[PDB]
Amino acid sequence: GGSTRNGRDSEAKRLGVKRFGGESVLAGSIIVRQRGTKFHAGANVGCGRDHTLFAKADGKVKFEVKGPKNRKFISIEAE
Amino acid sequence: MLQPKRTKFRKMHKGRNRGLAQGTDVSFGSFGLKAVGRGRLTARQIEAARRAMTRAVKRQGKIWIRVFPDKPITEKPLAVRMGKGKGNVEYWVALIQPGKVLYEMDGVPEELAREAFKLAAAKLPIKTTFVTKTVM
Amino acid sequence: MFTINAEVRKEQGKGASRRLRAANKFPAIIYGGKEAPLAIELDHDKVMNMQAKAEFYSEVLTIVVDGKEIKVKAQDVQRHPYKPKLQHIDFVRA
RNA sequence: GGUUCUCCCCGAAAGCUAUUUAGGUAGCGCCUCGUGAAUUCAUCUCCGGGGGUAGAGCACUGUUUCGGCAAGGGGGUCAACCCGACUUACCAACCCGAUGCAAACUGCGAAUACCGGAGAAUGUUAUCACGGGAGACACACGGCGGGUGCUAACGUCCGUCGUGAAGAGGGAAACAACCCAGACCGCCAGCUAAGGUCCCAAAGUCAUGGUUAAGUGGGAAACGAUGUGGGAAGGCCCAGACAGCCAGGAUGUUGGCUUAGAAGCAGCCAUCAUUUAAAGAAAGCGUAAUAGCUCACUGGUCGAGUCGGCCUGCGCGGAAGA
RNA sequence: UCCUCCUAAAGAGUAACGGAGGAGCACGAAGGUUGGCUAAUCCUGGUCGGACAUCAGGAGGUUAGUGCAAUGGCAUAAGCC
RNA sequence: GCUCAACGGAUAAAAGGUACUCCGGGGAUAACAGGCUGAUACCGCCCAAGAGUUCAUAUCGACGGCGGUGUUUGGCACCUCGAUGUCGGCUCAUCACAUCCUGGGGCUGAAGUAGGUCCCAAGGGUAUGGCUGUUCGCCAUUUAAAGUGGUACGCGAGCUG
RNA sequence: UGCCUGGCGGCCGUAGCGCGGUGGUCCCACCUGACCCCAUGCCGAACUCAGAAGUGAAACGCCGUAGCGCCGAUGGUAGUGUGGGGUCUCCCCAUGCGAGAGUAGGGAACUGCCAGGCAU
Ligand SMILES: [Mg+2]
Ligand SMILES: [Mg+2]
Ligand SMILES: [Mg+2]
Ligand SMILES: [Mg+2]
Ligand SMILES: [Mg+2]
Ligand SMILES: [Mg+2]
Ligand SMILES: [Mg+2]
Ligand SMILES: [Mg+2]
Ligand SMILES: [Mg+2]
Ligand SMILES: [Mg+2]
Ligand SMILES: [Mg+2]
Ligand SMILES: [Mg+2]
Ligand SMILES: [Mg+2]
Ligand SMILES: [Mg+2]
Ligand SMILES: [Mg+2]
Ligand SMILES: [Mg+2]
Ligand SMILES: [Mg+2]
Ligand SMILES: [Mg+2]
Ligand SMILES: [Mg+2]
Ligand SMILES: [Mg+2]
Ligand SMILES: [Mg+2]
Ligand SMILES: [Mg+2]
Ligand SMILES: [Mg+2]
Ligand SMILES: [Mg+2]
Ligand SMILES: [Mg+2]
Ligand SMILES: [Mg+2]
Ligand SMILES: [Mg+2]
Ligand SMILES: [Mg+2]
Ligand SMILES: [Mg+2]
Ligand SMILES: [Mg+2]
Ligand SMILES: [Mg+2]
Ligand SMILES: [Mg+2]
Ligand SMILES: [Mg+2]
Ligand SMILES: [Mg+2]
Ligand SMILES: [Mg+2]
Ligand SMILES: [Mg+2]
Ligand SMILES: [Mg+2]
Ligand SMILES: [Mg+2]
Ligand SMILES: [Mg+2]
Ligand SMILES: [Mg+2]
Ligand SMILES: [Mg+2]
Ligand SMILES: [Mg+2]
Ligand SMILES: [Mg+2]
Ligand SMILES: [Mg+2]
Ligand SMILES: [Mg+2]
Ligand SMILES: [Mg+2]
Secondary structure, X not given: OOOOOOOOOOOOOOOEEOOOOOOEEOOOOEEEEOOOOOEEEOOOEXXXXXXXXXXXXXXXXXXXXXXXXXXXXXXXXXX | OOOOOOOOOOOOOOOOOOOOOOOOXXXXXXXXXXEOOOEEEEHHHHHHHHHHXXXXXXXXXXXXXXXXXXXXXXXXXXXXXXXXXXXXXXXXXXXXXXXOEEEEEEOOOHHHHHHHHHHHHHHOOOOEEEEEOOOO | OOEEEEOOOOOOOHHHHXXXXXXXXXXXXXXXXXXXXXXXXXXXXXXXXXXXXXXHHOOOEEEEEOOEEEEEEEEEEEEOOXXXXXXXXXXXXX
């Protein structure tokens, strides 16, 4: 017989994009869950404790790449 | 036998050797032996072929071994059950794709090169073929 | 000297290229200058015979396409990975 | 383990979580019935967004080869005791120029998968919510991307679809997982798919051009050999291509040798030089060794086809079990 | 028991007695605000002082750093006063 | 106020043997067998550094590779736990040919007698005793040999233990 | 209306480095000195508060340079969603989607507000 190590693992946190862009959201709705600030907060977008982007106003979610470093920003178009 | 001096990890997945070759032309010497089939060459086979070609040419030139064994192949010990972790590392192989150049040389004449590669190819499972460098 | 009687490629694509290669031919491209690139279809054996000569990649070549002779140079060539075959050839218009 | 009369309609699972739990149970995922509900849901077309998996690459993290720049060492050829003249079938930091590999590498990057917005057409609302009732948490095979194993198992573990489970028929001899195709009933009706049309066994001994001589068809590899057609490309050409055969085939020279006599059949080196009309101190060779023959190299007869390397289909040997 | 990477097939999730590592804490400051600041490495000169410190200049731009293992981020700095 | 860490935690409070065992079940799950694969096992073949006075093939053959059988050791748990008795010994044989002898040939580093290797060929034959329960093996003496395997590692509704 | 300068933005790797030398009548920088009121955990190295003696020397900005970094076609290749196949550890065809790298080439940024100084 024998024994083997490294048999441990961790539970997934279900990260990723939730609204996927182009959807109609409400105030306080969570858009993306992530560890690091891969997507930065834009217009009417707040940053959570764990870098979660929540919309502060109902409207449309838009993905764009702005900034000097070509960073992705989430924008809330209040149409 | 040649193998990497150190690696980040000891064990690797089996993987699949599908696709085409990357280095398909001789860029160092003038004559080359290149694999035409598909398989996995081992360090022992590479060393045997290198020794055969070296003793055939009497080291009257240069030899280039394009491929390098870097994939650790592990086998479980005999008479043991399934599971209980992954088997210990056994040897090292190099994934081979069709059209990839295996050995390169120069200086020696065409007859000597073809008579040396002819006996150096029998030490490898994968069928090989002889080519000469061209202008692009 | 190195004259190649070419034609005009009717359809382009992976399937068209495979059919051309199976029909003892191979596609090629002539680009450069200001004129639009021209896709041509060449016979395999005759071009394979000239490829052995070292002058093919050094001196100018004449391509006759529907009677219009064009001076081109063998810019780049793609060959079969493990077979004496020609996949695709580029020609700079000069 | 067993659970007894009939018919009609609908109809799954062997999955997740927890469990002194793993062959039980509870909730959910899946099923049935009833009540309500919105263009609710599904297919297709257009539009917006996320990728970071194939593939590709070495800008980063690891690995690796040959070159230049180099410090140079290790048996020196040579002194043979020298500074070592010098490279001694060796190794050798960065820097540049190329060549590869990576599930825990990505300066890049698809198809598909998934969400949302708009639109026609179709589908017995197929969609959602609640309540009554269950059943079930032993799955297997094949296709696809994989871990593990030996890219071994009718082996095992994951994700999608199909199949059976819960499914009759036709085809592959039989053969749940392959292919075609979804059995309301009855027919001495026709058509077709898989699959065939010489007889078992039903329908081409059909038509048009080729390959096969092995019964290949109707088991298998590395390799090997003028089987046989095809495709080009080569060289030798009436200035006579190749094999018969008629013949020559020399000297200084029994070449320094090494010895065994060595003169080619024991040897490192030599096949230097007269005529070369032609002319190998000779490749075979009997042999104590020569003393002999032949061929290499040629010109005497011929008289139209040859010489050997690739891309190709079939075929041959490797092929030995009760 | 919990967390990080891959297998995990470019949304989420996804198994094995698979491959690799950690966690059962610390901090009244290691938190809040304001103001200010930008390394690792290497080269040159210089008294001890050295393959190494403390200094002055230059090459380089995050190849440093995160209280911790790993992943994703940090220049407006999440890095340092 | 609980390393209830067996961490969705039985109770504040818990170790072993049974071959003296028994009950309900499983081939859902093992041991002997049969099936599947062949890592390992046996055998065959491919190229050639050489050994062999020079000389690679008369005999071998390193560094390497490709295969056949199921044939030992191995993996799965697919039939069997509402029963398939497995070691060895006696009698009884069949089949395979990868042939021990006999039979017919090739090569030979085959002078002869007597040898090495390879091909075809299964028609026939192919030990007696001491040791230990033997298979295996050692020894003593013969023969041409006392050949290798499968048959539920053959055969206990043919026999012992 | 045209020259260049300043401030705020869009666009954030054809928008950035290297080389050549120009700019001051304006604006900016260098700079003078500093008890204040402020400052260095030491120094006006940085903030500043009082200004114009000089300079464009460093910067800043502008014009050309193909030495770089980059943007990168057409064609070809790899991959594949569906269906159908072979000799099935992998590959073929009918179909659409079609990469990465490397060629041809492009290239020494455009553009919106006011705020002045210039000729008109
Ligand atoms: Mg296609
Ligand atoms: Mg139904
Ligand atoms: Mg139970
Ligand atoms: Mg209902
Ligand atoms: Mg996916
Ligand atoms: Mg219900
Ligand atoms: Mg219910
Ligand atoms: Mg369960
Ligand atoms: Mg259960
Ligand atoms: Mg069951
Ligand atoms: Mg299952
Ligand atoms: Mg499956
Ligand atoms: Mg599979
Ligand atoms: Mg399998
Ligand atoms: Mg099972
Ligand atoms: Mg059942
Ligand atoms: Mg059926
Ligand atoms: Mg059937
Ligand atoms: Mg009919
Ligand atoms: Mg028909
Ligand atoms: Mg048909
Ligand atoms: Mg058919
Ligand atoms: Mg048929
Ligand atoms: Mg027929
Ligand atoms: Mg009939
Ligand atoms: Mg055949
Ligand atoms: Mg055969
Ligand atoms: Mg995912
Ligand atoms: Mg701050
Ligand atoms: Mg308590
Ligand atoms: Mg418990
Ligand atoms: Mg019992
Ligand atoms: Mg069963
Ligand atoms: Mg068994
Ligand atoms: Mg059985
Ligand atoms: Mg020898
Ligand atoms: Mg027998
Ligand atoms: Mg025989
Ligand atoms: Mg008999
Ligand atoms: Mg007879
Ligand atoms: Mg027996
Ligand atoms: Mg019986
Ligand atoms: Mg200046
Ligand atoms: Mg293209
Ligand atoms: Mg491209
Ligand atoms: Mg490009």
